[PDB]
Amino acid sequence: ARLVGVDLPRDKRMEIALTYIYGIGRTRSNEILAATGIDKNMRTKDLTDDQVTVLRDYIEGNLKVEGDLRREVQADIRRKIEIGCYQGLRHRRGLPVRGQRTKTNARTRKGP
Amino acid sequence: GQKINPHGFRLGITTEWKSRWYADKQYKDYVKEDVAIRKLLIADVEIERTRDRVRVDIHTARPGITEADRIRADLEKLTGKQVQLNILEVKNPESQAQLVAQGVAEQLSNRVAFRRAMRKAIQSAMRVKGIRVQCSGRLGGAEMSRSEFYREGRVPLHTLRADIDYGLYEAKTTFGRIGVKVWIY
Amino acid sequence: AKKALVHKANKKPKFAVRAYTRCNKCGRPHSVYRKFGLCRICLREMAHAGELPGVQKSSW
Amino acid sequence: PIQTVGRRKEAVVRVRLVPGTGQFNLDGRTLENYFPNKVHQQLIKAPLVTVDRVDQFDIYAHLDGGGPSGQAGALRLAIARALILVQPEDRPALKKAGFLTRDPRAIERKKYGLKKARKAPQYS
Amino acid sequence: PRKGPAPKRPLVNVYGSQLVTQLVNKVLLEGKKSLAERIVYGALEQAREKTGTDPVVTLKRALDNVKPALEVRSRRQVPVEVRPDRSTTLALRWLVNFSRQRREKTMVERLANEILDASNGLGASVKRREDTHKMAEANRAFAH
Amino acid sequence: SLKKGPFVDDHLLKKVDVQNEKNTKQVIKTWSRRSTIIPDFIGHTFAVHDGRKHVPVFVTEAMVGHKLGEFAPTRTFKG
Amino acid sequence: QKIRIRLKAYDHEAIDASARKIVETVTRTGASVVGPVPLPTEKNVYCVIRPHKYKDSREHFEMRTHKRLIDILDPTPKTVDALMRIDLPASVDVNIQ
RNA sequence: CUGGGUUUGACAUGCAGAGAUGUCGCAGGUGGUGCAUGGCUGUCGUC
RNA sequence: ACUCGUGAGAGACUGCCCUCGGAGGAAGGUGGGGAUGACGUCAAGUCAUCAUGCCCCUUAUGUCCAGGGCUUCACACAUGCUACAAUGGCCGGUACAAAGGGCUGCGAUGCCGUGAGGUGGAGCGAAUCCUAAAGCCGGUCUCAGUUCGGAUCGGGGUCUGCAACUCGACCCCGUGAAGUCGGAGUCGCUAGUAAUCGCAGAUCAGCAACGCUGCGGUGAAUACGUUCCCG
Numbered sequence A: 001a002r003l004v005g006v007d008l009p010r011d012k013r014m015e016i017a018l019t020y021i022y023g024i025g026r027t028r029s030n031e032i033l034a035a036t037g038i039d040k041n042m043r044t045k046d047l048t049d050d051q052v053t054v055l056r057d058y059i060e061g062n063l064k065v066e067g068d069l070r071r072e073v074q075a076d077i078r079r080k081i082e083i084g085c086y087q088g089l090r091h092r093r094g095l096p097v098r099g100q101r102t103k104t105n106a107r108t109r110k111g112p
Numbered sequence B: 001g002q003k004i005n006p007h008g009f010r011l012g013i014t015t016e017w018k019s020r021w022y023a024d025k026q027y028k029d030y031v032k033e034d035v036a037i038r039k040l041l042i043a044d045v046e047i048e049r050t051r052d053r054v055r056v057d058i059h060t061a062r063p064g065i066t067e068a069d070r071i072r073a074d075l076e077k078l079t080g081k082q083v084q085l086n087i088l089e090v091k092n093p094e095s096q097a098q099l100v101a102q103g104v105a106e107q108l109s110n111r112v113a114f115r116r117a118m119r120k121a122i123q124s125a126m127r128v129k130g131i132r133v134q135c136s137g138r139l140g141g142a143e144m145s146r147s148e149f150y151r152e153g154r155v156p157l158h159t160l161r162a163d164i165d166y167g168l169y170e171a172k173t174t175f176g177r178i179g180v181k182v183w184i185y
Numbered sequence C: 001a002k003k004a005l006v007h008k009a010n011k012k013p014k015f016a017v018r019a020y021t022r023c024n025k026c027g028r029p030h031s032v033y034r035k036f037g038l039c040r041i042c043l044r045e046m047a048h049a050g051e052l053p054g055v056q057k058s059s060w
Numbered sequence D: 001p002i003q004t005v006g007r008r009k010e011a012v013v014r015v016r017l018v019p020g021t022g023q024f025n026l027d028g029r030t031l032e033n034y035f036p037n038k039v040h041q042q043l044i045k046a047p048l049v050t051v052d053r054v055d056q057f058d059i060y061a062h063l064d065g066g067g068p069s070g071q072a073g074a075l076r077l078a079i080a081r082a083l084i085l086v087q088p089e090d091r092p093a094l095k096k097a098g099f100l101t102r103d104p105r106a107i108e109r110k111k112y113g114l115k116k117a118r119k120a121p122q123y124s
Numbered sequence E: 001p002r003k004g005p006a007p008k009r010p011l012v013n014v015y016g017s018q019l020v021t022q023l024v025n026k027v028l029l030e031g032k033k034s035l036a037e038r039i040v041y042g043a044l045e046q047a048r049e050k051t052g053t054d055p056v057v058t059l060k061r062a063l064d065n066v067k068p069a070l071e072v073r074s075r076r077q078v079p080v081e082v083r084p085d086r087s088t089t090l091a092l093r094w095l096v097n098f099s100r101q102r103r104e105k106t107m108v109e110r111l112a113n114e115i116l117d118a119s120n121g122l123g124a125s126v127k128r129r130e131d132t133h134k135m136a137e138a139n140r141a142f143a144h
Numbered sequence F: 001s002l003k004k005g006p007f008v009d010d011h012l013l014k015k016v017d018v019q020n021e022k023n024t025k026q027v028i029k030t031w032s033r034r035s036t037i038i039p040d041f042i043g044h045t046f047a048v049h050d051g052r053k054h055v056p057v058f059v060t061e062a063m064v065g066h067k068l069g070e071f072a073p074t075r076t077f078k079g
Numbered sequence G: 001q002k003i004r005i006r007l008k009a010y011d012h013e014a015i016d017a018s019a020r021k022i023v024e025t026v027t028r029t030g031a032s033v034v035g036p037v038p039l040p041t042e043k044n045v046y047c048v049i050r051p052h053k054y055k056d057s058r059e060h061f062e063m064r065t066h067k068r069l070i071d072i073l074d075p076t077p078k079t080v081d082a083l084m085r086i087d088l089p090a091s092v093d094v095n096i097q
Numbered sequence H: 001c002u003g004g005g006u007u008u009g010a011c012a013u014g015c016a017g018a019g020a021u022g023u024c025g026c027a028g029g030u031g032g033u034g035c036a037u038g039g040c041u042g043u044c045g046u047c
Numbered sequence I: 001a002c003u004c005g006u007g008a009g010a011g012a013c014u015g016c017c018c019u020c021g022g023a024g025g026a027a028g029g030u031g032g033g034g035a036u037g038a039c040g041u042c043a044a045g046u047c048a049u050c051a052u053g054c055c056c057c058u059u060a061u062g063u064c065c066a067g068g069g070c071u072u073c074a075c076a077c078a079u080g081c082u083a084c085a086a087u088g089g090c091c092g093g094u095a096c097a098a099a100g101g102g103c104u105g106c107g108a109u110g111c112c113g114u115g116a117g118g119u120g121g122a123g124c125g126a127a128u129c130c131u132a133a134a135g136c137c138g139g140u141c142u143c144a145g146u147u148c149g150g151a152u153c154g155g156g157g158u159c160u161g162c163a164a165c166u167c168g169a170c171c172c173c174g175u176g177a178a179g180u181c182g183g184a185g186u187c188g189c190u191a192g193u194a195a196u197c198g199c200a201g202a203u204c205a206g207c208a209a210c211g212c213u214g215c216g217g218u219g220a221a222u223a224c225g226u227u228c229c230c231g
């Protein structure tokens, strides 16, 4: 019930339970629970404690669960910002990065 | 907007294409070829393209204006096909639509006054069921433009069965250009 | 659209992309119909005057 | 034999009658399986049930064009014509019931300046 | 409508009841009849099974407890005698709208429970007819 | 994203092949914006055109995957 | 041993002149052919704005290519000589097959 | 707009270089004036 | 034979009892929609489609070329998609369109790949060849900013193109931002119409396309009335 990363979803199906982990969404959770493995309609309460640790060992090594992953996205931005690429000139003034028009409605980046 | 072209409006019923040739793969080229001819080269001009052959038929009031056989050779370079040229006459150049406009085009270009020059065309051509004629814009070197018309008999534009012969020409004065228009039913 | 930029379109483009298709009579860049190879405006001068065989108004 | 048209909304049907027990088939399929729908069930059988022949006749039918409500409504007019070719006793019943009318309902043309047929855009 | 009355739509009746096909269209949104009808057949045949134990008259007796005889209008408030057929339009259309407002999970259940409250006269649909009659009959002065 | 292969424009890379003899020296004028930075380049200057003037651009191993045009911003907003 | 004369042209009345002209030439050698058979008409459509800044106005411009299929059943050396030679359609495509 | 070239002007009467271009094998002008104009549309109004 | 494609035709005019209703007829009394814009208004738009009077540039305001730029951004208005959830989302089954487009083209079976694709070229200048979704029966989630929402961002890729940094969109994986039917005020629509759901085309190597112009699927509500505003 540890979830490896830390947090435990408050029950429900297992297919979606793994999406609350930062490394994993829907397709990689389908890949885990197929192989590891245990059915989609199984719930998080009705797993035994050793059945949770079979999920731990398989995905712990393979992907970034949270902090390792969390730092890598920021650390790639930190170099790219000062990397001098135009792509991270746009990071330093809080504007959109991927070649959008900033005349009307860039409010995801800029904010209210 | 006001008044669609009555030549184009009755294409299905009674007008018949000036160009009467068919193609598919060569269709872009034959339009580009005809644009060169009608700029280069008068009542009316028809064409009946066939592979390696063109009619290039002409209607003119004065047919005589030897020189045509040189103009064949001028067209021969642009087309690159066997030009079988015909120049034709037309009965009543008085009654023909573009030749009335070309008649008034000579008058206004030579500084004949427009109310004098118009009245000739409507009176003579009626001497057809009805005629409307209209000269438009910059008349006798006035500062502001105007358009006035004359008419005699009846000219129903909305009737599809009625064959209206339409014509246009831009007669070019010292001050600008006057656009003449001639409807003959 | 000028005289000089018309003869650009006639010339060999150097790269196969740059052939951009002016109108034949109109000499206008925008809205030149393929097949017709004519300016959109020019199409209405020709089609009303009975010049393009097989082309006529309209609806429906 | 009796062979009969029916149309609706550009949905071109065929029908043919043979006397027999109460069923009918649609390109090698049952009525219930082609139309799983209670509204379309009664609407096909309306000229049969109003006149009260019902179990007299087979129908074999071909279905082209349109959709489920189009082809279901098209069978009604196909049958309504076809039951007259049995005997024209049924015609004065079927006319007053109101099945011999095809719909001059058809989809209007989308016009320039307008997004659907009649609907203009926003203003001022 | 200025020049004269346009003709009213003809309306086909499994149950064979005018009111149910009228209810189907008031339920209907997005122009799809089948999902409109299966919610009606969900709610109607739920009220058949559990409580009322006949299908049509549970709705029809409940529909009397929605129907207003009188309505308010502003000349610029004059109360007006409502037509026999216009009373039925307000009867269905209110009954559907408060089913959309209700908190219960699905419209099979929401539209079912609304018809049961209209049979009693404790519902939000039956609440409105009193408010229209209250606003109508408190005036009367303005009617001339 | 040039699927298979990187792109450098051929007139650019010839000037870099001259620097091999010198092992790279000075800053070379560059009017092709469009070329990638192939790791032959690393530790070299060039003066890259802004559509106005030439901006000096030193190269490092961080700038390999990025294109040569990314380090000269063409329009200016201070306000 | 079957020849197919495919026609394409704009004017539907002008093909009815030619479709008769195919019959008279082949029915000299006598009988045979299907006759003409209608075949569906194509329609290219082109919407154009009526010089600048007025989008809502519009025209439409059809072009219709009417087509006939014919199908000659019997090839004969007397037929094929007369078929091409004396037959001349004016401003109408003919493709033998 | 910053440049690099050209001059009766592109139109009629392989090695170098960013590349055009080198060096060997009267025309023209999206240029001012739609309150100089023609032509072609919008609109009041399918009234 | 029945369709269906065209090609000829007939059939609706209150013609039989102002208008209420009759009998057939597939149809009613402007059957449905388009095409059509009188005499004129606004010195209405365009010298930038093309023409053109007058004036100006003639050693450049003409004329090639690479480079940028037309895609900026505190903001403001307008037009439109996607949404805010169970008349749902995901996912397995099973099925009904008619208009179209195709020679530097459209591209099938087949094997490779998670997929955009790669491979290879059958057939084809065409009623032959290539090109529905919503629905219905089941399953699963339980009124949560969620299995709603798909923006933004980080890694990687594919494809045309000499070249996708300025600025192409495509789909795999991580991230899951605002948003809980919207203030004053405002438009669209009288029946196969509103509302929703797809498909094709023109321009086009490629595509900023949710735009534009056409086609068909499902398919309502209400028109008591003329005082009330608008013309």
Ligand SMILES: [Mg+2]
Binding pocket: D116
């Ligand atoms: Mg529609």
Ligand SMILES: [Mg+2]
Binding pocket: H031
């Ligand atoms: Mg000028």
Ligand SMILES: [Mg+2]
Binding pocket: H034
């Ligand atoms: Mg003006």
Ligand SMILES: [Mg+2]
Binding pocket: B158
């Ligand atoms: Mg009229």
Ligand SMILES: [Mg+2]
Binding pocket: none
């Ligand atoms: Mg003005």
Ligand SMILES: [Mg+2]
Binding pocket: I070
């Ligand atoms: Mg722009």
Ligand SMILES: [Mg+2]
Binding pocket: F079, I073, I074
């Ligand atoms: Mg600013």
Ligand SMILES: [Mg+2]
Binding pocket: none
């Ligand atoms: Mg499915």
Ligand SMILES: [Mg+2]
Binding pocket: I204
């Ligand atoms: Mg495209």
